[PDB]
Structure 1
Amino acid sequence: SGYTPDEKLRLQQLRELRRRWLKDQELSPREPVLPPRTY
């Protein structure tokens, strides 16, 4: 009742996709926000 090995590979490479997509998703190159152009 462990798994289907097919599902092991599927889950694995889906993890790959989450990896790359979230690497993308973190954004801080070049501080992308650049809006213009006592008494």
Structure 2
Amino acid sequence: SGYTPDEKLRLQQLRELRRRWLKDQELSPREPVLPPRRVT
């Protein structure tokens, strides 16, 4: 039983891609660039 070598390799590659995507989902310190404007 267990993973075949191709399954290990594909899981590892997909894992690296997924972790890079997840890291890229983060926000920079300026990311919410808010446009400011008014008129007891």
Question: Structure 2-normalised TM-score?
Answer: 0.68
Identity of matched residues, % = 95
1:3 is matched with: 3
For residues 2-39 of structure 1, what are the alpha-carbon distances to aligned partners after superposition, in whole Å with 9 as ceiling and x for unaligned? Answer: 11110100000100011110111122331424134993
Moved more, 20-29 or 3-12: 20-29
Task: Give the length in aligned residue pairs.
Answer: 39
The SS at the match of 2:6 is helix
- Give 5+ residue unaligned stretches, structure 1: none
Sort the Cα spacing of 1:38 and 1:17 in 2 relative to 1 into closer, same or farther, 3 A.
closer
